[PDB]
Swiss-Prot record, chains A, B, C, D, E:
PTM text: Phosphorylated by PRKCE in response to LPS. Phosphorylation is essential for its function. It is depleted from the membrane upon phosphorylation. Tyrosine phosphorylation is inhibited by phosphatase PTPN4. Isoform 1 is myristoylated. Required for membrane association which is critical for its ability to initiate efficient signaling.
GO MF, one annotated term: molecular adaptor activity
Name of the featured protein: TIR domain-containing adapter molecule 2
Keyword line: Cell membrane, Cell projection, Cytoplasm, Endoplasmic reticulum, Endosome, Golgi apparatus, Immunity, Inflammatory response, Innate immunity, Lipoprotein, Membrane, Myristate, Phosphoprotein
Reported tissue expression: Expressed in spleen, prostate, testis, uterus, small intestine, colon, peripheral blood leukocytes, heart, placenta, lung, liver, skeletal muscle, and pancreas Isoform 2 is ubiquitously expressed (at lower levels than isoform 1).
Listed result of changing residue 40 to H: Loss of ability to dimerize. Significant loss of RANTES-inducing activity. Loss of ability to induce NF-kappa-B activation
Modified residues (Phosphotyrosine): 91
Keyword Lyase assigned: no
Protein role: Functions as a sorting adapter in different signaling pathways to facilitate downstream signaling leading to type I interferon induction. In TLR4 signaling, physically bridges TLR4 and TICAM1 and functionally transmits signal to TICAM1 in early endosomes after endocytosis of TLR4. In TLR2 signaling, physically bridges TLR2 and MYD88 and is required for the TLR2-dependent movement of MYD88 to endosomes following ligand engagement. Involved in IL-18 signaling and is proposed to function as a sorting adapter for MYD88 in IL-18 signaling during adaptive immune response.
Superkingdom of source: Eukaryota
Quaternary structure and partners: Homodimer. Interacts with TLR4, TICAM1, IRF3 and IRF7 in response to LPS. Interacts with IL1R1, IL1RAP, IRAK2, IRAK3 and TRAF6. Interacts with protein kinase-inactive mutants of IRAK1 and IRAK4. Isoform 1 interacts with isoform 2; the interaction occurs in late endosomes and disrupts the interaction between isoform 1 and TICAM1. Interacts with MYD88; the interaction decreases after IL-18 stimulation in a time-dependent manner. Interacts with IL18R1 and IL18RAP. Interacts with TLR2. Interacts with RAB11FIP2.
Amino acid sequence: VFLKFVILHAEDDTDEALRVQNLLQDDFGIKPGIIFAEMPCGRQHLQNLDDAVNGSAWTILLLTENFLRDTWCNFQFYTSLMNSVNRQHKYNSVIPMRPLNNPLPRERTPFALQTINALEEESRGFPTQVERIFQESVYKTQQTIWKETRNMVQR
Amino acid sequence: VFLKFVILHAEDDTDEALRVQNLLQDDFGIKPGIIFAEMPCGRQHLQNLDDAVNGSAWTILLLTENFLRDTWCNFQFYTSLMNSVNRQHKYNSVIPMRPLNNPLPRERTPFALQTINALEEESRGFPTQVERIFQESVYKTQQTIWKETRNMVQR
Amino acid sequence: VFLKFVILHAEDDTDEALRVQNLLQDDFGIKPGIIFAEMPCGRQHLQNLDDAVNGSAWTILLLTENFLRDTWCNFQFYTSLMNSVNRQHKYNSVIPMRPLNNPLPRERTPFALQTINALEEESRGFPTQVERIFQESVYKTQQTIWKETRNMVQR
Amino acid sequence: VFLKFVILHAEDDTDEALRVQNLLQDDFGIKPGIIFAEMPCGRQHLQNLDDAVNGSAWTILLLTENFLRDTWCNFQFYTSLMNSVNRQHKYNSVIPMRPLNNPLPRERTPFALQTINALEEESRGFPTQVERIFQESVYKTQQTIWKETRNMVQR
Amino acid sequence: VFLKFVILHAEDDTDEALRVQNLLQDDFGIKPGIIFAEMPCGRQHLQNLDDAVNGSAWTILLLTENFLRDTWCNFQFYTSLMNSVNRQHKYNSVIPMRPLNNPLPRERTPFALQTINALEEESRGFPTQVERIFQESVYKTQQTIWKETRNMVQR
């Protein structure tokens, strides 16, 4: 399995993540895709995070007003940022998007996100920019590598 | 005999274990499966535990609010954890699941369980994640080995 | 009589038990202490086991390579494990220690022991950890109770 | 007892841990401090881990080239990470430090560690940064709480 | 602690940063001051960046020929630029200075820096312009605020 998109969320906002997940899968037909919670039960969350980073092309940060309020949440996506930096194959995989439900405002955004275009479903821009960018060839390039990039790990 | 699932329970909660056992067997058709109490009478509980660990693919921890309250109960599943660690054939066989009847809360969970996805029949997630995971091939792989893994013990 | 330590051994290894017994008594001055064989002649072994469990603070499992090879040997220390679980006064009295002479290896250890720190005279650790733990107050606490715990049985 | 530092190590590297332990204790006078192996014999390793987490101010990860190669080793420090996240009293207690003996290289570091400053005795930086940080008041603050934080557990 | 100056550098050029740091501290007596590497060990680099931005009056960009060659380096000082824009208290705190060791040439400078006076230790100008500008009152103004600006954060 390899995902077109993965949503990172706080459990308080899983309905929003789902809603987004639905919107992503349903409207765009962008499937398969996983939210952090679904990852195989009975395993370590950390290990699933690492595997999840590998298994997803793009990495959606559900920028909910209190997404930052829980410390470990800050820790989790930090590693994702590095992974985008580390591997060309994941370059810009980390997609900050303000939710509809209580988006994080610009007043206090962490500067790191301020340096990046943070999207929003409220905006006219989001769907056209996704359409223009999140396309077969862009995904095809990523997955084609991924599979062989993990065959090495299974030989 | 080899089990798809084995439930570990405290005698105070055997009705819940049964109910779960029924739900598992009845709804999913996941049969055969045993709860700790049923193991052959007249034998040592410890020895049955060891054999039970071998005889079951997955190992359900009935995380009842007072499941931890009895010390030996803590001892019992500790060994199961090791067995998951020890043998690939039992990797993640230990499935922490909060019951419906007075589940153990997150306030005081033993950190070890906190590191793991603990399931719950209250959740929307549990049945779909089981369906996606607890499937013929996954069980087939485990049992196929088990039988020969014990023929060695009976030659 | 109440013992600081009791050694459980197979007759094939009594020299090792003795050697250990000597080392324990001689080096540490930890006296008195008994090995399973010495228990009063002409009595039932089982009954001596029960009394021996009561009469000893700590309970050394001479983990010789074939200590497990004789079935009843497995049965004997099983009851000791329960007694540690049953009585606070005997909590952790059961001390698995790999001998010098052909210690049981980690390859096949019974998982129950794997969950526990099993000591070894080969290690640098064993003597310092004993010194730090097996001390007057720890023993004093146990014996002080024991005596009155059996006066009840003799009134 | 409460420790200024605790070293987490794989048994293959205990000499390095010791050497580090010596260097820490001897050069800086930072005493007392324990390595994972020393924890009271005859007890469960897991339980000692939990108590060890409580008993130490700082938590040194002996990042030896094969420290990650053993799975349970990965599991162990995962819980420590959470404990740093969970309790302010342990904030940043988890100190990743590359050993002298075959340090883990940056080529394959687990991203989580990549997000953190990992120290190294090879560097000019390590001793001055410790001196500037690991100081009476910082330790005093931690221990002063710890003692009362466990008096609650012993009342 | 509050710094007169902070140097931002790539690890390949730490000797230059040090040399500059020495020159700054030694020649001008401008102390204390920190280079990016020194920030407290065991913490997140990003968080230290944010705190470092607050803790320094002026922010030296070690414009080494390959300072831009590493992408995240570009990201880091971008946030600093904003902070100068955001807060009057940090207005022009960001001081681009070409090093002695392989300075970035004007041929390919990023236009943003081209709009700004970029200093150079090779020039006659640098020391007199620093003397005329980096003076007690200018620093006094900044620190006096800083301290109370963080008392708000610690009340």
